[PDB]
Amino acid sequence: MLKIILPSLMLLPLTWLSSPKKTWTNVTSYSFLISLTSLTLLWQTDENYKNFSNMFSSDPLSTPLIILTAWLLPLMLMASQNHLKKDNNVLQKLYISMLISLQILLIMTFSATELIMFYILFEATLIPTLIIITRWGNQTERLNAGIYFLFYTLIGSIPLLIALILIQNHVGTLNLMILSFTTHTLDASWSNNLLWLACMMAFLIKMPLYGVHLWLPKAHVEAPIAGSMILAAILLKLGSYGMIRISIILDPLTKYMAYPFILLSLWGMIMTSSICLRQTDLKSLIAYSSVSHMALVIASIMIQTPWSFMGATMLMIAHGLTSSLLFCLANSNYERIHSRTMIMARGLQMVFPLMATWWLMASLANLALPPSINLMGELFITMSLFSWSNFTIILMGINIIITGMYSMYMIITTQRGKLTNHMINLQPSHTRELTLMALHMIPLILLTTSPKLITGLTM
Amino acid sequence: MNPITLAIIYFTIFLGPVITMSSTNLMLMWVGLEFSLLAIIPMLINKKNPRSTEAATKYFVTQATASMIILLAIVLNYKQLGTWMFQQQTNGLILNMTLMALSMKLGLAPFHFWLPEVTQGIPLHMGLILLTWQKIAPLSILIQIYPLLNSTIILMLAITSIFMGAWGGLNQTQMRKIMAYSSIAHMGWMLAILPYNPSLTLLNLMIYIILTAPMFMALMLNNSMTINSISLLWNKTPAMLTMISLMLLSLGGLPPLTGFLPKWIIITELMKNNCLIMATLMAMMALLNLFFYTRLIYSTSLTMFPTNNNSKMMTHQTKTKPNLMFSTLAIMSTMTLPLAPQLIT
Amino acid sequence: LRYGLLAAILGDKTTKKLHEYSRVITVDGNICSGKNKLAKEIAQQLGMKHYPEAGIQYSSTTTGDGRPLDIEFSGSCSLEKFYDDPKSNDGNSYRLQSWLYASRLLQYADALEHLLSTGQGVVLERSIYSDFVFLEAMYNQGYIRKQCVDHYNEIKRLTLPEYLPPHAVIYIDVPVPEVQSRIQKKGDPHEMKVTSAYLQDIENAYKKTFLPKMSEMCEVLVYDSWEAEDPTKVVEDIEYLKYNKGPWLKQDDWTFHYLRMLVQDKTEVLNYTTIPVYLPEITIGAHQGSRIYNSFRELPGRKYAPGYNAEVGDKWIWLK
Amino acid sequence: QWQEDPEPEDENVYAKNPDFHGYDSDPVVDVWNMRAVFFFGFSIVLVFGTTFVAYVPDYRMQEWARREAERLVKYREVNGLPIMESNYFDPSKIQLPEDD
């Protein structure tokens, strides 16, 4: 793992010791190379997971997330070059350093064998994110957004720390290999129920749930493009990874302590997908779609069946890619008109014909167009739930309908229709942002070709 | 102030706590406390303004009352069991009044109403001393008698200090009062664990000291005493915003900064004794403590408040400050968690 | 050694530096009254040092290269435009007035630092004590608002008491018609459209507050323009003064030590000029301020500290 | 009204450099950033990593399990045994309670 982390560190001196002109090229290229190096984790020729030390490891669940996190860095760097073009060299270097630190901390979190390192880094991913949001966001709601984002997470995480320390005092170690073989039934009691709550609510607030999801749209709306990308793609997957890892020691309390959360998720899916219809802000639309999608992940993880974990992993990967893509697409038009409203620019297929194919393909991946992996996850989650209770497919299906509806609405009222002739400032598409969409899309094709990689420990 | 007077007074300030630490007899601990509070006053009132005079009065009266109470405790423990230093066979009333008076001195809640004012009325280099060097001797006393302290009283005092520090520094515009309430909260932490393990309260003290000293140094760089003033650092000393933000986030208790280590290793040692509720509440309110540090980070570094037409001059001129110790302490106060095993034991 | 407690103990005490002419003098007066030449002659004859009047570019002529800067750095204030459009809705009037007060504060600090260090006297053409004159002149003429006056007086009662007043004041009275004629004889196009009421207000402020306020702590010598000439006459009136009124007598080596440690810290001098009172006449804004600050740092001898810019001929940087 | 600079005017980045790729205002930097991005993203990563993955053998023991299932069904049909026993663990290994 050091062979993936130490290069990510040396990227920092490469960022600072580089000439102002060649600072972006070097870091971008070497980040691509590190994304390449991260592909050795897929060399799993057995059912024996990779343990590199007492601290670093990588299972079939953490490897996809690590590769996605190593691959998103250069895309964020690229997306973050049109803005920052008028900022000073030191500010650009500081932005790049924030992004690199995020990459490093996330790779650590996904490689961690122990839950205390996971927690420390889970929390350390707040500093660079908050800085990015509040320092390079454009409107004044930056600050309230950062506040929400900090304190939802911390108020959720503190109980998690208490519960981890309790488990330490009771068992002797917070290692994940040991806590899986040395396990005991949790006697059903209010104490252990509060332990379940403590262990879960931090992640549930980070996925997020329906009842607690207001920190996400504020951030995405008020966050620069890179922050939105990393947030949507990884900083939500963080909670699902945590739940999947920690739900082994909460058996069987998960059988009856889940109904509230399964239910909230299944219903908030509908609520959010419906919000995505009467929504003026494109970024808010993307965020509410993300919430609708993560609700399924939460429910799946709650029922903890193999099909369920598999669909959840696939949906995590695919949603990360496609949401990063949609935010890139939105910011493309934002850089022209400097407005987030989806009603102002509504004929962009008559000027950007190629960029519209990216909109089309993304909105098709947003909805479940097969054989996309955005669809296999939804399908296996639907199947797991149907097995759970045959009355879930009702809500699943109305969510499907609403999903198609608002994705089509997005692309229609944004690209199709009559062009806004007063928008003389609609410069053609930049090779850079086109490369961005291509790099977001092609990996989806490749995964759809080889889904065995993004299944997870269950398969 | 001439160098002879400065020598005598600073030597006395230093000597006070040394006697308290290095003494077996309680009476000499008392005279050390008295040296401290007698020598510190002229350094407060040196500026000679009404605020300084009333700060001095509020400090002197409080510390004198607390010292008289400690002396009563010592004299009762002498009348009983005919020795000076306390022993296992000593009245809990004596021990608890002693603890209460030591809190009064330290400034713990609900004995805190005097510390914010006394710190607002004086200069900053003295607030530094007041909040760092004058909180040791009391803690020495408490660490020599930790097996005998009641856990109920210290824990009530600690949760009260936490809550009141948070709620009080929450709506402060002056920085000195923010530091006063930070001291109150971190002392609540220091004290919540003292009977179980006093090797951790000393750790939290060292960390709080190396954290607050460079903050006070920053404030003294441009004699900054308000939020609106530090908002002007991006124009005067932008090379300080990084360290400021990191030290603030550490004081709040955020990983991966070593201000989180005291919080974490105290919650641990408390749950090793089944104090779930205390540690829970303490953490949940340390969050609120962090909140206003974050608002302050906003005001200072993560956004750029308006400046004045005259700061251009300050830009023209040169500066000899800070010294080498600021960078040292600010680095050893944020980027040292990896060495925690070496710090904890 | 950079002055401090230690150097003060080992020596470098002030009272031994002083002599019969270690005095601070501020020859005041209205515009075009004859202050600069008289100050120069006094300096020359008494062996004092001459400090020309402090304008907009003092902090530049006394720092770095010692040359003028672009005006976006030195106050963004103009006297020419002050005379052209005094009641401007941009705020150049009080901007200029406060910048000038701060420059005179810096100048007085430098002058005291020189006197105390070397014991040499100094001659000033105006002072922070005679700068409210123009302010009240403006206010009486609606050039500025009362809020600006309150800001000014706040900074005054924050900065002024920490400094020792001058020893002698030399006011050269000149009627307003004489100066309103000299200003035209000078031929400066912008100064010619100054109103005689402004000058009468300056004169009234002087006569009513300054002189009777300074005649309690420093000797005032009031001269007319015929005595102002033959500057040997004023020198003779100076050489035979009896300094028996003021705070300079209840002084000692340690008061001087602390005052010197202050005036040799220009940032601690100017601290109270940057207080965050958000007047829309001097509040600069983050974008403008940051553009200006980044450009100023891009300036050859200003990117780093003095002695650390190899771009201007500094070599042993790897060894400091 | 306090002093600030006025909101600037948007610029057409193709105005001065029509052969603009979106990376930098300086052309040479622009071209070389474009080339490095394309190279290291498509030519290097999306090709060589794709191949490296496509040629990972026996991913999570998938081919081996198939071969062994073939071996086992063959052996068990040839030796009369069934293809799957309802009990993984031989009961001899198991000692159930002496419930009374």
């Binding site: 390079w136 966001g137 454009n138 409107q139 004044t140 930056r142 400097h338 | 929450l170 709506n171 402060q172 515009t173 308000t226 939020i227 609106n228 908002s231 005001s299 956004t303 750029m304 408040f305 308006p306 | 965050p276 958000y278 829309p280 509040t283 804004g285 983050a286 974008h287 | 306090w2 909101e7 600037p8 948007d10």
Partner: peptide, 19 residues
């Protein structure tokens, strides 16, 4: 278009004797 930065109305809320 421009990154919003705090104005006098924002700074004056931190300018009282209490928050």
């Amino acid at each position: 278009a421009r990154q919003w930065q705090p104005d006098i109305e924002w700074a004056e809320q931190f300018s009282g004797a209490v928050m």
